[PDB]
Design a protein around this ligand. Structure first.
Ligand code: HEM
Ligand code: HEM
Ligand SMILES: Nc1ncnc2c1ncn2[C@@H]1O[C@H](COP(=O)(O)OP(=O)(O)O)[C@@H](O)[C@H]1O
Ligand SMILES: [Cl-]
Ligand SMILES: [Cl-]
Ligand code: NA
Ligand code: NA
Lengths: 713, 713
């Protein structure tokens, strides 16, 4: 059946904004996963998981009699899709169980691992999400094998459909680089926002770059991809060597024996895939990656034998039974156990990417330290494993259960506790009047609060106005935030704050974070009053102010808006059309298409554009909250044409006289072009719509201001 | 950006079930369009539309100074996509303003027509939908040009995103027959459910079949496509000749001058398309279809000139200025006015498909009768226009406003008015006890009610349990309804009915329609009791019983389920996989995926399968309402394989012994295979889910029983 996407493959896709509707969710509209989790007997879940580790099923027999290695790989791949560029991927939504991730070649046979967990999922039901269970299972695996984890938090609610993520443009699984849809350009520069080297891989190719078995070159790809997953050198080495303390790879025969991935398999496979015609198809005969390596002499027990072997042997290039490149220890004795036959032993083996840990010079220093000091290794691995598996969970207020680590980690973007009474409704009214009496304008107040709150992204729940990180490096200097203008606003608000706080009794005070938001609220109320409408914008206090020392400047870089269509802002010229970047930002904000449309049209007329640009400001009463953006955009009396100077800027002229009325960008005019967006614009540009536009604008503004308020959930 | 549909282009698409969420709808969740419409000043709207008729805009100047022909075409196209096979298409959702229909070649320049209406739409806002406005406009165009319409009803709520309709499989607009994705096979047999001859046409090709200008052959295509739009020969001749009493076609120069359709155009085009480089690109120079025909001597006034011209001249084949085949009157004088230049006149001209009305022998007899009795023509056209524009609106209870025709038409599937007291809760309890005491089983009660209610489709709001048409021809004889079993259940219910009704005073009586549904409710209650659960199922009385003479047996044929996954029924072997047909049915029933899931699993254990098939009956307690379907389907202790006899039937055997435990179809097993469906099945097959399953099942059952209850809306 031919679809709209077939006829118009480059038209903008709004379906991404309308995922996760109540229609697709089997749980009631009142279901609260945190409340269910908080009553889970977590210790009981863990006991059942511990038992499972050594209860082999004959349909996928346990290597060494222990499923721990398999489950650790499972949890690492669940988390391993994360990209810092956009926060997408990660373990936080349990997306491994849906397409495409359930059928990526790097996730081969994890379908088996998830199926092993159905009896426990079934027993506990809604009180433990798949998303939490995948991670918990990896932690129990670790514990069962003698490794002390750093802790665990629940709270990852399940999702019910695939997320729309850009994983690359290749049309062939695992395509090598340099194809017509190459994700690499220049000197091996990987395109943002990607964080894997080949389509369908987690991070890197275990044979080496595009299959070339050079550990030094592979190290480059490890370092780049791991950094794009928010891991530094120490963390990277700790993770890889920690993981590869356990279990084995699977490559017992040729890969041509392996059948269709789950999404392609027949209905009778019941959601499993990669059925193998090689011998028994499983166990001793398993084929997963095609490699056949077993790293340590005790694959079912924590040890420091990975680095003992890495450094204690010289390594020879060899081939697995499937033909993949891998390495074997020269001259070694057969000291590695076989997974099924207690009479067989094997020489030590390694992946190309394992040898990167010794042959890259910066890795080698860390790896040596960890070899000489395994307690340092263990602690780094524990810390890195917690980070890996929690990096997309959001603020610590979302962490549930009895095993949450008390230590506050800098990567969590922590917010200090509030230890004083909060402002009440009368205080809020007093502050809004003081802010308006200062002389700050509607535009300055709206723009400041927008800048502070719109850093949120729902992908990894980072950003937002909590913390008042807008006053700190690097936010205070981002171009989109208008550094000089911002500094002036912040100085004014800080003076109002000082004055109010100095007047109080009983310890009541207002944080700068709360006052930035409140001041934006006052701006929107004032703009409504400028239009003739008396409205109260909701405000919820309780944000706190973070310090510079609590703020990782390098980690915060990925949150810089380089494209913010809500402020008509593009930092440079991109391949992707600006309207596509608008919808991407709207999705990060968690906005629907109606929400996106009302918000943008209101921001344009409040003066929120960076640089005071007139593009899209289709009103003669700027700083009044009206629907003028939509009424003027939709006026057929105006004709639009791209400018000669810039194809991305348009002039709107009166059709009869030629008189210049307006200018606009692609982000402004998509609302009058796209057939779905134009239908939304029409509602708000109708003669009956002024009350509705104000009400809906206020509601979406409040939604944005509150995106990171998990303290109120 | 590669998507899941790219990787797995034949996996089932559940997005069709989660359209029309509250996320994409800009109106509040409590918006009620009927209440808005009922307060519209419809008379005011009609005055504005009358004014618009002759208010020419320079960007698309009005032919003859009157937009009435353009608007008639616009409304006839809005309606003209309707297909009786599935009820999809039609005017009722205003879908002409969205992709793909806004850009079909046959809808060229209707973008202009819609844009002329924006000022009126803006003025009246939410109180008139686009969907109602398009039809109202057509009516006013006819009235303006001297034709008295049969009536008009409002109530077509707007929609906010495209419907997922199968329009065909061709990948080329307008492709002629016999290609790789041909919609024709055999003896020019058009594939169900399509009702057009070429991709992007409304019904037929105006040059003739595949472009061949044979009026007799064209008439075969006219007859078939119009029958697939619910129109008979009389209706067809009346509509074509009535439409073509007005206006003209547009083909002033070669089609290669015409640019991108709306969804392909540049952002500056602001939602319009088909910009033409030919001369002024509009008005006298317009190119729409490529034909250049004006049918009557008064194109802006109702006349009897269409049939005068058709019969009064002999016709010669010629070409338009764009090269399209059309006909010109031999020897005629230049009597047809020019649309723009009072000094030019033209000879009478006709399309191939107009000549079909004279050269097909059955049409010729009707055409002659209309030529000799123009009052008959006028009345037939008025009735056909009303049908055309209301065919998809559903029961008359949904018709709004002061111009609704009082006359009840057979095609409306009319339900008699209720003129007696209805049964109350105490009476319902008495009837349910009588039904359970009669010996009817859970299976018989559930299956009967299911058969009665599940004929509803939301596409055209036809079907459902109101009317008790299950007792009439042809529903009573449909294979899926199990005619012999049905007759025995109906005879028992009719005896209960008669006994109850004869005992009442004051006029109270229960309809058979209500009793069917109530007895199904008693079946579900009894099944829940059989499972240990104490459940009351909601019931709303007020259905009435329609007569056989109120039930057009040929129009009812399209409602026959040839595939009904809910009863594991397939009438024959089809090219479309059964699970796609299940999703199709769910969409017609208005079900989400969770609703489809719970419903199907419950129906399987209640004994609703046709023929008492064991396929998917995964329980040892049939006729008890439990979640057994899910718990057993998901048990990894069972392995599934297709049977040797039939690749579409599967056997589930114990993995350890080989012993046969169950059999199932594709519709049963897709719930254990599709990664989204299986995530839903998991919820209902969890240990905590029995009460959730029962409650959800009751809710969805109640939903289905009330789908046609627009008397209660
Ligand atoms: C450069 C990064 C990495 C590469 C290229 C990589 C590669 C692979 C490959 C090819 C396999 C074999 C799959 C199979 O055939 O069964 C595997 C297994 C495994 N990986 Fe990694 N890995 C990486 C990092 C990690 C990390 C960060 C962890 C966890 C902290 C991890 C834990 C494991 C474990 C436990 C197994 C064994 C699975 C079993 O016993 O079934 N790996 N690795
Ligand atoms: C066999 C069925 C039919 C065929 C093949 C057909 C074909 C067409 C074509 C090709 C045009 C010219 C488009 C353009 O170049 O502007 C047209 C115009 C039009 N049709 Fe039809 N038609 C059919 C039935 C109808 C019916 C059922 C109605 C309404 C009751 C209708 C009303 C009109 C009107 C009013 C115009 C004039 C448009 C204008 O003045 O701008 N047609 N038809
Ligand atoms: N309209 C009704 N008439 C009679 N009983 C009802 C009605 N609606 C709900 N109930 C009963 O109340 C129970 C729970 O009510 P509710 O909270 O509305 O959720 P649901 O959408 O599951 O019906 C139902 O399972 C049914 O037995
Ligand atoms: Cl994601
Ligand atoms: Cl439709
Ligand atoms: Na994420
Ligand atoms: Na329809």
């Amino acid at each position: 059946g031919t679809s709209n996407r077939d006829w118009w493959p480059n038209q903008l896709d709004l379906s991404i904004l309308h995922r996760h509707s109540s229609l697709s969710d089997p749980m009631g509209k009142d279901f609260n996963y945190a409340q269910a989790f908080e009553k889970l007997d977590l210790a009981a879940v863990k006991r059942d998981l511990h038992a499972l580790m050594t209860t082999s099923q004959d349909w996928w027999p346990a290597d060494f009699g222990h499923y721990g290695g398999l489950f650790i790989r499972m949890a690492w791949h669940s988390a391993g899709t994360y990209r810092t560029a956009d926060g997408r991927g990660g373990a936080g939504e349990g997306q491994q169980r849906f397409a495409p991730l359930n059928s990526w070649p790097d996730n081969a046979n994890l379908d088996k691992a998830r199926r092993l967990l159905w009896p426990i999922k079934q027993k506990y039901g809604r009180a433990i999400s798949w998303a939490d269970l995948l991670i918990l299972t990896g932690n129990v695996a670790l514990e069962s094998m003698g490794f002390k984890t750093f802790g665990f938090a629940g709270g990852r609610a399940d999702t019910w459909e695939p997320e729309d993520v850009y994983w690359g443009s290749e049309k062939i699984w695992l395509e090598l680089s340099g194809g017509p849809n190459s994700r690499y350009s220049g000197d091996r520069q990987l395109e943002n926002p990607l964080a894997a080297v080949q389509m369908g891989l987690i991070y890197v190719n275990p044979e080496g770059p595009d299959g070339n078995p050079d550990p030094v070159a592979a190290a480059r790809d490890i370092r780049d991809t791991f950094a794009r997953m928010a891991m530094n050198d120490e963390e990277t080495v700790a993770l890889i060597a920690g993981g590869h303390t356990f279990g084995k790879t699977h490559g017992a025969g040729p890969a041509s024996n392996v059948g269709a991935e789950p999404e392609a398999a027949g209905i009778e496979a019941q959601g499993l895939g990669w059925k193998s015609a090689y011998r028994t198809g499983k166990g001793a005969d398993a084929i997963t990656s095609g490699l056949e390596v077993t790293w340590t002499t005790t694959p079912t027990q924590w040890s420091h034998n990975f680095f003992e072997n890495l450094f204690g042997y010289e390594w020879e290039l060899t081939k697995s039974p499937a033909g993949a490149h891998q390495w074997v220890a020269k001259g070694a004795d057969a000291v590695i156990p076989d997974a099924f036959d207690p009479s067989k032993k094997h020489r030590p083996t390694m992946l190309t990417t394992d040898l990167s840990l010794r042959f890259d010079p910066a890795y080698e220093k860390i790896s040596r330290r960890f070899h000489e000091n395994p307690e340092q290794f263990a602690d780094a691995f524990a810390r890195a494993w917690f980070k890996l598996t929690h990096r997309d969970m959001g603020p610590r207020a979302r962490y549930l259960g009895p095993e949450v680590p008390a230590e506050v980690l800098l990567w969590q973007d922590p917010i200090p506790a509030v230890d004083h009474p909060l402002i009440d409704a009368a205080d809020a009214a007093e502050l809004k009047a003081k802010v308006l009496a200062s002389g700050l304008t509607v535009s300055q107040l709206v723009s400041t609060a927008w800048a502070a709150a719109s850093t949120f992204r729902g992908s990894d729940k980072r950003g937002g106005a909590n913390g008042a990180r807008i006053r700190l490096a690097p936010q205070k200097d981002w171009e989109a935030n208008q550094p000089e203008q911002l500094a002036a606003v912040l100085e004014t608000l800080e003076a109002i704050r000082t004055a109010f706080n100095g007047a109080q009794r009983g310890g009541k005070q207002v944080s700068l974070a709360d006052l930035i938001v409140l001041a934006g609220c006052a701006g929107v109320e004032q703009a409504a009053k400028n239009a003739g409408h008396a409205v109260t914008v909701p405000f919820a206090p309780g944000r706190a102010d973070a310090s510079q020392e609590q703020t990782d400047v390098e980690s915060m870089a990925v949150l810089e808006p380089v494209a913010d269509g809500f402020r008509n802002y593009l930092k440079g010229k991109y391949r992707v059309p600006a309207e596509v970047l608008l919808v991407d930002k709207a999705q990060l904000l968690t906005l629907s298409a109606p929400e996106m449309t009302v918000l943008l049209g209101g921001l344009r007329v409040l003066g929120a554009n960076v640089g005071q640009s007139r593009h899209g400001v289709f009103t003669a009463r700027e700083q009044a909250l009206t629907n003028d953006f939509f009424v003027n955009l939709l006026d057929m009396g105006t004709e639009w044409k791209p400018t000669a100077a810039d194809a991305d800027v348009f002039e709107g002229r009166d059709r009869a006289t030629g008189e210049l009325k307006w200018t606009g960008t692609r982000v402004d005019l998509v609302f009058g072009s796209h057939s779905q967006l134009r239908a939304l614009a029409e509602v708000y540009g109708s003669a009956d719509a002024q009350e509705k536009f104000v009400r809906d604008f206020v509601a979406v503004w409040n939604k944005v201001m509150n995106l990171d308020r998990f303290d109120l959930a």
